[PDB]
Write an enzyme that holds these catalytic residues in place. Structure first.
Site, PDB file in Angstrom:
ATOM      1  N   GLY A  67      24.724   7.525   0.182  1.00 50.45           N
ATOM      2  CA  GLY A  67      25.884   8.600   0.183  1.00 50.45           C
ATOM      3  C   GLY A  67      26.422   8.806  -1.254  1.00 50.45           C
ATOM      4  O   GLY A  67      27.405   9.514  -1.586  1.00 50.45           O
ATOM      5  N   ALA A  68      25.417   8.794  -2.246  1.00 51.00           N
ATOM      6  CA  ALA A  68      25.819   9.382  -3.592  1.00 51.00           C
ATOM      7  C   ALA A  68      26.972   8.772  -4.162  1.00 51.00           C
ATOM      8  O   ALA A  68      27.482   9.321  -5.055  1.00 51.00           O
ATOM      9  CB  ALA A  68      25.657  10.632  -3.490  1.00 51.00           C
TER      10      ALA A  68
ATOM     11  N   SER B 128      19.332   4.529  -1.212  1.00 49.01           N
ATOM     12  CA  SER B 128      19.747   5.547  -2.013  1.00 49.01           C
ATOM     13  C   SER B 128      20.913   5.070  -3.126  1.00 49.01           C
ATOM     14  O   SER B 128      20.418   3.967  -3.844  1.00 49.01           O
ATOM     15  CB  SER B 128      20.448   6.701  -1.505  1.00 49.01           C
ATOM     16  N   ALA B 129      22.095   5.288  -3.032  1.00 47.11           N
ATOM     17  CA  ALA B 129      23.296   4.855  -3.722  1.00 47.11           C
ATOM     18  C   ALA B 129      23.399   3.362  -3.442  1.00 47.11           C
ATOM     19  O   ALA B 129      23.852   2.635  -4.029  1.00 47.11           O
ATOM     20  CB  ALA B 129      24.349   5.546  -3.375  1.00 47.11           C
TER      21      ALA B 129
ATOM     22  N   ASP C 210      10.833  11.655  -1.856  1.00 48.57           N
ATOM     23  CA  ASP C 210      12.319  11.371  -2.112  1.00 48.57           C
ATOM     24  C   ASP C 210      13.075  12.718  -2.870  1.00 48.57           C
ATOM     25  O   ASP C 210      14.245  12.867  -2.275  1.00 48.57           O
ATOM     26  CB  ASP C 210      12.585  10.155  -2.648  1.00 48.57           C
TER      27      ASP C 210
ATOM     28  N   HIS D 100      12.971  13.296   9.206  1.00 48.58           N
ATOM     29  CA  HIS D 100      12.182  12.697   9.981  1.00 48.58           C
ATOM     30  C   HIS D 100      11.345  11.685   9.037  1.00 48.58           C
ATOM     31  O   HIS D 100      10.900  10.506   9.308  1.00 48.58           O
ATOM     32  CB  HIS D 100      11.200  13.340  10.787  1.00 48.58           C
TER      33      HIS D 100
HETATM   34 ZN   LIG Z   1      16.261   7.127   2.328  1.00 46.56          ZN
HETATM   35 ZN   LIG Z   2      14.124  12.057   2.295  1.00 48.09          ZN
HETATM   36 ZN   LIG Z   3       7.173  10.176  13.143  1.00 50.57          ZN
END
Ligand SMILES: [Zn+2]
Ligand SMILES: [Zn+2]
Ligand SMILES: [Zn+2]
Ligand SMILES: [Zn+2]
Ligand SMILES: [Zn+2]
Ligand SMILES: [Zn+2]
Ligand SMILES: [Zn+2]
Ligand SMILES: [Zn+2]
Ligand SMILES: [Zn+2]
Ligand SMILES: [Zn+2]
Ligand SMILES: [Zn+2]
Length: 523
Positions: A108-109, A195-196, A321, A425
């Protein structure tokens, strides 16, 4: 005798809920809302939580830490937010003991998020039940402070920052002291996060604060070396907040104490990242993130990898990403009837390479557009913009981290992955957490195949440090990463022996780590 009942923790007794699963006697004990630290004070380090009398009912998720809503108009959460949640799987004859323990750190950055995640199809994203029961591990989730309240800093002792990293550390230490009472093995704690959260996992393994606490770690799409992780100029961002909330900016100490007594909602809403248009790439506006404080983070993370010498480590990325920042920096890549041009991409590249000037912009533009002569289609051009952002924000930092962790390894093993599929997705989190099994109407059989295999690798690794060895079968032998083999596992719908690949985008890694750095810095 087959479930936990009231558990004695250091703060007192705790009662959760037992959920029966299947028909033959399995179940899962669920605890939500166990405090691991006191109600927070604005911009102060976390403190022990006082004990309680009687039996704490750990029946519901507690409030997230105070943060901006996604429209950045208002706030929700509360200062009393440092709570954690536990899933303990149970078999049908005896209560579980000495189980591996996985602690999830959300992303969530560094700006938003909670221990339960987004709700979709009547299921919380970070609901740990499917990992716990399919992998026979304990799963912990928890809240930490975000935004200015988690990361404001003057870059000095007046306001050292990293409050939210200290929150994470306090949750880890609580699990180490208490999880054996739940059936957990406190010597076998695996962190994982995305991520974060993946960068936080990485930062936690590098911090001397965690000596002797962490056995293994998984970084998903984020490491401490990513460029969005360390704020090099915190005093600039603290001054920005001080001006919008009416604090003086002449003296760092006076400003620091003014901020500490400012309405925390005004602190949180002081700065909104513009949505469009922006003068700089999205990376420029990540403000309130970890800092090098000489304490929790004693030095530049690149110099800290000796601290992870006995922490087994997985790190990997998603094939696309960077599409998130790429869509903001170049909205044409989503509009099917708008072109990306050489001029648009040069502009974007130049903003990322300012320290190397015109020559740095050209060498980068030239290497990324090499394929444009033979394939000038918009498909190839828009894919190039995404690949560029993926490389600089995720892939290159992750490969450098793998190499650094391998070079400092004593007993630690190292593993690399690329997740390729086909919220969105394409993202790893839902397969790792088993959402295709918990809400199966939303997913197709191939999704359950991928998720089954990810949970197998993840929980085998948690158990043994070897993703191939544990309670679950895996479809492809995952070879440990070394400098020589530079192997990574490509995780897809259909895996087999050829899923174990090597040398991921090496020409681009070599460009960034050798050629680009050999250019003179301009000023
Ligand atoms: Zn991810
Ligand atoms: Zn993504
Ligand atoms: Zn799929
Ligand atoms: Zn409390
Ligand atoms: Zn909530
Ligand atoms: Zn309150
Ligand atoms: Zn034991
Ligand atoms: Zn500590
Ligand atoms: Zn900038
Ligand atoms: Zn510029
Ligand atoms: Zn092997």
């Amino acid at each position: 005798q087959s479930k936990l009942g009231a558990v004695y923790t250091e703060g007192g007794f705790v009662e959760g809920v037992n959920k029966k699963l299947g028909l033959l006697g399995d179940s899962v004990d669920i605890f939500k809302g166990i405090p691991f630290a006191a109600p927070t004070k604005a911009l102060e380090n976390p403190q022990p939580h006082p004990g309680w009398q009687g039996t704490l009912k750990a029946k519901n998720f507690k409030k997230r830490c105070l943060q901006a809503t996604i429209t950045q108009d208002s706030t929700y959460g509360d200062e009393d937010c440092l709570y954690l949640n536990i899933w303990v799987p149970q078999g049908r004859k005896q209560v579980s003991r000495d189980l591996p323990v996985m602690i999830w750190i959300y992303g969530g950055a560094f700006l938003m998020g909670s221990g339960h995640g987004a709700n979709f199809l009547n299921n919380y994203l970070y609901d740990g039940e499917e990992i716990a029961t399919r992998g026979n591990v304990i799963v912990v989730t928890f809240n930490y402070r975000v935004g200015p309240l988690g990361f404001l800093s003057t870059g000095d002792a007046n306001l050292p920052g990293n409050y939210g990293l200290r929150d994470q550390h306090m949750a880890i230490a609580w699990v180490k002291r208490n999880i054996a009472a739940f059936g957990g093995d406190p010597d076998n704690i695996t962190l994982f996060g995305e991520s974060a959260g993946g960068a936080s996992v990485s930062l936690q393994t590098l911090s001397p604060y965690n000596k002797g606490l962490i056995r293994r770690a998984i970084s998903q799409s984020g490491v401490a070396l990513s460029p969005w992780v360390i704020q090099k100029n915190p005093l600039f961002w603290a001054k920005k907040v001080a001006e919008k909330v009416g604090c003086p900016v002449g003296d760092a100490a006076r400003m620091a104490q003014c901020l500490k007594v400012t309405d925390p909602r005004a602190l949180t809403l002081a700065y909104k990242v513009p949505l469009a248009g922006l003068e700089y790439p999205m990376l420029h506006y990540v403000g309130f993130v970890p800092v090098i404080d000489g304490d929790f983070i004693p030095d530049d993370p690149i110099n800290l990898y000796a601290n992870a010498a006995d922490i087994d480590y997985i790190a990997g990325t998603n094939n696309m990403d960077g599409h998130i920042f790429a869509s903001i920096d170049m909205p044409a890549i989503n509009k099917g009837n708008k072109k990306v041009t050489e001029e648009d991409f040069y502009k974007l590249v130049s903003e990322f390479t300012i320290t190397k000037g015109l020559r740095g912009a050209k060498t980068t533009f030239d290497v990324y557009t090499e394929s444009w002569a033979q394939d000038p289609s918009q498909e190839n051009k828009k894919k190039t913009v995404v690949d560029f952002e993926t490389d600089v924000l995720f892939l290159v930092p992750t490969e450098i981290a793998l190499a650094q962790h391998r070079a400092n390894a004593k007993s630690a093993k190292t593993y690399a992955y690329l997740f390729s599929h086909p919220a969105d997705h394409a993202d790893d989190i839902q397969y790792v957490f088993g959402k295709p099994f918990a809400t199966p109407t939303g997913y197709r059989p191939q999704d359950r195949t991928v998720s089954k295999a990810m949970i197998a690798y993840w929980t085998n690794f948690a158990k043994t440090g070897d993703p191939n060895m544990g309670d679950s079968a895996v479809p492809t032998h995952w070879e440990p990463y070394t400098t020589e083999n530079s192997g990574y596992l490509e995780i897809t719908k259909k895996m087999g022996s050829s899923s174990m690949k090597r040398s991921l985008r090496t020409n681009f890694l070599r460009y960034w780590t050798l050629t680009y750095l050999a250019l003179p810095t301009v000023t």
